[PDB]
Design a protein around this motif. Structure first.
Motif, short mmCIF file in Angstrom:
data_model
loop_
_atom_site.label_atom_id
_atom_site.label_comp_id
_atom_site.label_asym_id
_atom_site.label_seq_id
_atom_site.Cartn_x
_atom_site.Cartn_y
_atom_site.Cartn_z
N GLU A 90 0.76 -1.24 0.00
CA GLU A 90 0.00 0.00 0.00
C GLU A 90 0.80 1.31 0.00
O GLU A 90 0.24 2.34 -0.40
N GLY A 91 2.07 1.30 0.44
CA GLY A 91 2.81 2.55 0.67
C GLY A 91 1.99 3.49 1.58
O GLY A 91 1.39 3.03 2.56
N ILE A 92 1.94 4.78 1.26
CA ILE A 92 0.97 5.65 1.95
C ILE A 92 -0.46 5.23 1.64
O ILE A 92 -0.83 5.18 0.46
N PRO A 93 -1.29 5.00 2.68
CA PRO A 93 -2.70 4.64 2.46
C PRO A 93 -3.46 5.76 1.75
O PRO A 93 -3.18 6.95 2.02
N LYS A 94 -4.37 5.39 0.86
CA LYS A 94 -5.12 6.35 0.06
C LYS A 94 -5.68 7.49 0.91
O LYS A 94 -5.35 8.66 0.68
N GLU A 95 -6.49 7.15 1.92
CA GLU A 95 -7.09 8.15 2.82
C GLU A 95 -6.09 9.15 3.39
O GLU A 95 -6.46 10.27 3.68
N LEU A 96 -4.83 8.74 3.51
CA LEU A 96 -3.80 9.59 4.13
C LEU A 96 -2.89 10.35 3.16
O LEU A 96 -1.90 10.97 3.58
N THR A 97 -3.23 10.30 1.87
CA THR A 97 -2.30 10.73 0.82
C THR A 97 -1.69 12.11 1.02
O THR A 97 -0.46 12.26 1.01
N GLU A 98 -2.53 13.12 1.19
CA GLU A 98 -2.05 14.48 1.23
C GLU A 98 -1.35 14.72 2.55
O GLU A 98 -0.34 15.43 2.61
N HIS A 99 -1.86 14.10 3.61
CA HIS A 99 -1.28 14.23 4.93
C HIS A 99 0.19 13.88 4.93
O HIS A 99 0.98 14.53 5.59
N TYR A 100 0.54 12.84 4.19
CA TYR A 100 1.92 12.38 4.12
C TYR A 100 2.73 12.96 2.94
O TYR A 100 3.95 13.14 3.04
N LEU A 101 2.05 13.26 1.84
CA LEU A 101 2.70 13.92 0.70
C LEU A 101 3.07 15.36 1.03
O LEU A 101 3.99 15.94 0.44
N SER A 102 2.33 15.95 1.97
CA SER A 102 2.63 17.31 2.38
C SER A 102 3.90 17.31 3.23
O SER A 102 4.51 18.35 3.45
N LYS A 103 4.29 16.12 3.67
CA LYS A 103 5.48 15.96 4.49
C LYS A 103 6.71 15.49 3.69
O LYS A 103 7.78 15.22 4.26
N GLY A 104 6.56 15.38 2.37
CA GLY A 104 7.70 15.10 1.51
C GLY A 104 7.87 13.63 1.23
O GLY A 104 8.82 13.23 0.54
N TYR A 105 6.97 12.80 1.76
CA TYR A 105 7.02 11.37 1.48
C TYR A 105 6.72 11.09 0.01
O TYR A 105 5.97 11.82 -0.64
N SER A 106 7.30 10.02 -0.51
CA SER A 106 6.83 9.47 -1.78
C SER A 106 5.63 8.58 -1.48
O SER A 106 5.38 8.22 -0.32
N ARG A 107 4.86 8.24 -2.50
CA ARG A 107 3.66 7.43 -2.31
C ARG A 107 4.04 5.98 -1.98
O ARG A 107 3.21 5.24 -1.45
N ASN A 108 5.29 5.58 -2.27
CA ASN A 108 5.77 4.21 -2.04
C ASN A 108 6.25 3.93 -0.61
O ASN A 108 6.47 2.76 -0.21
N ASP A 109 6.42 5.01 0.14
CA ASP A 109 6.83 4.96 1.54
C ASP A 109 5.84 4.22 2.43
O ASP A 109 4.63 4.49 2.40
N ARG A 110 6.35 3.29 3.22
CA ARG A 110 5.60 2.79 4.36
C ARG A 110 5.51 3.90 5.42
O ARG A 110 6.50 4.61 5.68
#
Ligand code: CEF
Ligand code: CEF
Lengths: 631, 631
Positions: B205-225
């Motif tokens: 799953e990497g970043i879970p769908k529901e959490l996408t922006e929350h974690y992308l706003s933190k510089g994570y890639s979508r593949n990140d656990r």
């Protein structure tokens, strides 16, 4: 033109430091109508001593009248009856000749003498509609209306700089009376949205007690007035006036030798809202119409009614509501319940379930399976528009047209790896499906915060889902987890947006300070941030909205009676939910418009209607509001 | 312990970048016992489809079983019935002779046939499955959630760094199987705080769908656990490690001509929690026996039972709840319920209500006015707990001893301006007094959030209070506004701490990213910040303490379970009232240990006891834990 109210004076040694409040920034609608502004006000208070009489106070009250005007009607019948006995004791005695005699018999106590003295009063009430009299009574009642050592507000009204100059000393001369200048929010649209605007702490209040750590850690002084609820709290950082600070050095004698400016001060920044004030007022008006646009058909224990309206493409908010305590039908403003309160919403969640059921490969797009009563070891789910017989081949759109529980029950079972067969046991660990399901619903905003720019949002009640599978199927049908009216809005909205969940906001833009200019140049746009996209294909997506159309544009589609057609095509879904007040129902409506390029969406919640639903029509609220907007 | 696993390999014209993943920080109890560790793990995965005759798909599962062993927890009854049928077409067709004919007679169709077969297969014949069958099946079921071209998980297998190779073979030699190395969490206390700890996302799953922006706003890639539930999500910033990032230059032939290391990576920071696990494990144990100790007396759907234990100085030393169904046995873990869920709570609010009295001078520090079965209007409507005993003389400190739910009722009116007189009207606007009361409650935690370091804390359901003073009196007696167990705990603990409300925290200390297993240099200490003092004064808090001290050390509730035992405990009790199906009752318990220099605070909530009269020793769970802690 930043204003100047002395807030805090500290003497150290030969240094004296002074702080002045300055006006907060204004709150305006999406079109620039002032909603919250500021007012310079004098506050006159009375502080009643330990041994202070009634003759004492009536006197001050008199001198206080020849000095300021008051508004009458806080005055009660008893106030007037008491004031009359106070003013006409000779006249009053004559009506109680027997009782004054039997007061010294001991036949009566004062506590029953005073009650018959009140009983015999009428045409003499007018003996002091001498408006001069009611004025004194107006002041006097507040001076008696409160705690001993505590000062008591008598008037807080708009004052000029010279007005205060002429009268403050000569008010202050009277015993008990003090005066102060104060900043006060003013509200042109009166009661409208007031809950949402929130308040700023009173001068009496410091930083509010429970908010200490909160404001002290951000640098405030305990004396600072701050936003303490909702919008004033939420945007305190921008609305606040950075106060003026001056450090004076002095002679021994008191003479200021030198002065330096720590802070010259900054009038707060103006905040624009997504709200169209007119639309707001209209919705509140329509909601009050509709609430008993039944004349209480049966709904005289409907206790809440909620409406949220929104732009489904940028998350702008145009939306309010209010509750109904019908031990009356006397309503209040439940403004904030739209995102702070949790309701079982039932069948209107059905679009999210299908989406859940699509992305887990549990059903397919167009899936056509058949439905009929269901049978387990006891448990007996009939859907409620044929419970006994009548077995119908039905696809996923149709299931939404009819709002057929058994389709959602069958997908749920299929999501559990346990497709229906008559007399099956309920699968005993439903942890895993329930999780897949919930994450489905979470994607369209159901069971997760919407992210709105206001404090106190709830995501809803979310109880363990492990080994009561009945609760599992309840969930697929909206009768387990409680949701929010804002959550419902976010949910249709992402359906209308081709799957893009957007973070709603009542914040529009942030401008810079002025005392005049009802523009002010822009500082910050507040964007409706994309939160995620549903894990579903356009075809999967389109199906839910095709279904949504034919629940409002088709015939046994359970939203024809209210949405059949009107000035613009509207797609949606509805919901009736069993709950226990004693047994009653919840009625729910979600939709959006127009189909081809949506621009509006909305959610409606009526709580505790008595109703079985071949009788009740609440989403006419939806119809009426949508007509107004688009014409 | 140590290592890196391949996560990302990126080309751009002879310049490969390789990102390796690293272990997360550990989670530990206050003394340093390992709660959440990491283990290096083999993810075995099946991905086949289009040539699925399913009979070969079983063959793969058969093949795989000779290589791996499987926990059989996840096998459903349906799993077994489908498998049994496949294993014995012999045995099943012998049970379907009537239905065999009907299919050929035409009267019945294959779906009905398969449906009837499923009902006829009972668990007795399901036992005909062999332990090895149940091993093939465990594998099989995983590979039959299989979308054709999409990988499903078979096993996570603790294999070493250096035997992964030996077994890595099973790759396109059993068809669909892919193998891979991943960092996974380890739990050496099993299920004992799993909800609170939370989860980190799958490598799938990497970043879970529901959490996408929350974690992308933190510089994570979508593949990140990432951390997705609770503590994992909450302390993501600290717990996550920095990846190892390599950069190589190849030539055309793929030969490495240079290399550079950009980050060598490091395990994430270690998180020490305030929880004591022996203390934690005891409460669950105790809590267990204590709901069995109501299996007897009728608690049939008592469906919730919760406990929160703590103190000022560092932390939540303890937090467990469970929930029940139907007394059917079934407990399921509901620790998160302590701060996420909203429960009507009863008389335990009185301590704070008595201080809201002091603040607004509705009462004095010691005040004595008496209890009547008191009435107002309508023609019947009246009040509390016995109808005749016109009882007298009570101190306020005596009022909490009895839990005098009438002294409170008087106090409300005396705060709303108009003390009781028999036969009195309702106030018709109770905004102002409701607000002051509510304010008073927020001061000690009741009605705001505690400020705990976990997601989804709720502040309780808070409805409008303006013109139904029926509800306003309920609020004095904890029957209008729901709190959380955590809210009660911060509240009782505010009393123990002489009027000082503390912000609970479950994090104790953050430690520096250390490469080698002892908990590293102190990075941050997580503090129990004083949010506020009550503006209740020195002697005014002491009464509430004495009040508490005297419903634990005599008065008659609280004696029946806290009959001084190991403990100078002071505390308070609450019985509530719920008509959510049928008149049940909520039973709640707060209190604090050694009264002199208080070291422990606790809160308890039992929901939906069917049993009103004040007899149940549910607060024994309370008395029990103090024996442990004070040895
Ligand atoms: C506190 O809230 C009190 N609760 C009640 O009186 C119940 N409803 O109150 C509105 C009442 C008790 S049983 C019946 N079924 N409803 C109780 N507080 C204490 C206590 O220790 O809990 C006692 C004085 C009993 S009253
Ligand atoms: C959705 O949940 C609707 N079901 C119901 O409304 C009944 N309870 O369902 C669990 C309800 C009918 S009245 C009685 N008190 N319970 C289905 N969806 C629509 C709707 O708009 O509500 C209808 C077709 C009824 S069924």
């Amino acid at each position: 033109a930043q204003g100047s109210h002395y807030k805090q004076i500290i003497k150290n040694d030969e240094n004296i430091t002074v702080n002045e409040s300055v006006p907060r920034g204004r709150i305006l609608d999406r079109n620039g109508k002032v909603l919250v502004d500021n007012a310079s006000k004098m506050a006159i208070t009375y502080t009643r001593g330990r041994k202070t009489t009634q003759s004492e106070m009536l006197d001050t009250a008199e001198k206080l009248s020849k000095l300021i005007k008051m508004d009458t009607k806080k005055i009660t019948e008893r106030d007037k009856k008491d004031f009359w006995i106070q003013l006409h004791p000779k006249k009053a005695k004559a009506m109680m000749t027997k009782e004054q005699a039997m007061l010294a018999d001991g036949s009566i106590k004062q506590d029953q003498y005073d009650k018959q003295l009140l009983s015999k009063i009428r045409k003499s009430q007018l003996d002091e509609l001498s408006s001069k009299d009611l004025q004194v009574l107006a002041i006097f009642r507040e001076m008696n209306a409160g705690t001993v050592l505590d000062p008591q507000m008598i008037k807080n009204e708009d004052v000029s700089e010279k007005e205060y100059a002429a009268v403050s000393q000569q008010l202050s001369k009277l015993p008990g009376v003090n005066t102060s200048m104060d900043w006060d929010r003013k509200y042109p649209y009166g009661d409208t949205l007031r809950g949402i605007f929130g308040d700023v702490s009173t001068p009496a209040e410091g930083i509010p007690k429970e908010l200490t750590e909160h404001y002290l850690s951000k640098g405030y002084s305990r004396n600072d007035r701050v936003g303490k609820s909702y919008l004033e709290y939420q945007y305190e950082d921008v609305l606040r006036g950075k106060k003026k600070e001056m450090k004076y050095t002095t002679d021994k004698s008191g003479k200021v030798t030198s002065s330096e400016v720590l802070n010259p001060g900054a009038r707060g920044q103006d905040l624009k809202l997504t709200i169209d004030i007119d639309l707001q007022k209209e919705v509140e008006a329509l909601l009050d119409k509709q609430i008993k646009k039944l004349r209480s058909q049966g709904a005289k224990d409907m206790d809440n009614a909620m409406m949220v309206v929104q732009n489904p493409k940028n998350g702008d908010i145009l939306a309010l509501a209010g509750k109904q305590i019908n031990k009356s039908g006397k309503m209040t403003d439940y403004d904030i319940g739209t995102f702070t309160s949790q309701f079982a919403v039932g069948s209107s969640v059905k679009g999210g379930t299908l989406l859940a059921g699509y992305q887990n490969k549990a059903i397919k797009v167009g899936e056509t399976m058949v439905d009929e009563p269901l049978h387990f070891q006891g448990g007996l789910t009939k859907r409620s528009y044929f419970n006994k017989n009548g077995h119908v081949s039905i696809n996923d759109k149709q299931a939404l047209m009819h709002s057929s529980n058994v389709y959602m029950f069958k997908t749920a079972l299929k999501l559990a790896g346990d497709p229906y067969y008559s007399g099956m046991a309920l699968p005993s660990d439903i942890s895993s499906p329930a999780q897949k399901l919930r994450r489905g619903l979470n994607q369209v905003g159901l069971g997760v915060k919407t992210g709105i720019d206001l404090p106190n949002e709830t995501r809803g009640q979310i109880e363990p889902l492990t080994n009561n599978p009945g609760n599992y199927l309840d969930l697929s049908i909206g009768q387990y987890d409680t949701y929010t009216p804002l959550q419902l809005s976010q949910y249709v909205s992402t359906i209308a947006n081709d799957g893009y969940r957007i973070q709603p906001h009542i914040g529009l833009t942030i401008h810079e300070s002025t005392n005049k200019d009802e523009v002010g140049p822009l500082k910050k746009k507040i964007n409706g941030t994309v939160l995620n996209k549903v894990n579903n294909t356009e075809k999967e997506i389109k199906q839910i909205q095709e279904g949504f159309k034919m629940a409002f544009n088709d015939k046994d589609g359970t939203g024809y009676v209210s949405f059949k057609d009107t000035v613009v095509p509207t797609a949606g879904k509805t919901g009736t939910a069993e709950v226990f007040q004693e047994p009653r129902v919840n009625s729910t409506y979600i939709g959006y418009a127009p189909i081809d390029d949506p621009k509006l969406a909305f959610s409606i919640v009526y709580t505790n209607q008595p109703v079985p639903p071949p009788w009740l029509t609440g989403g006419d609220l939806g119809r009426d509001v949508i007509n107004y907007y688009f014409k």
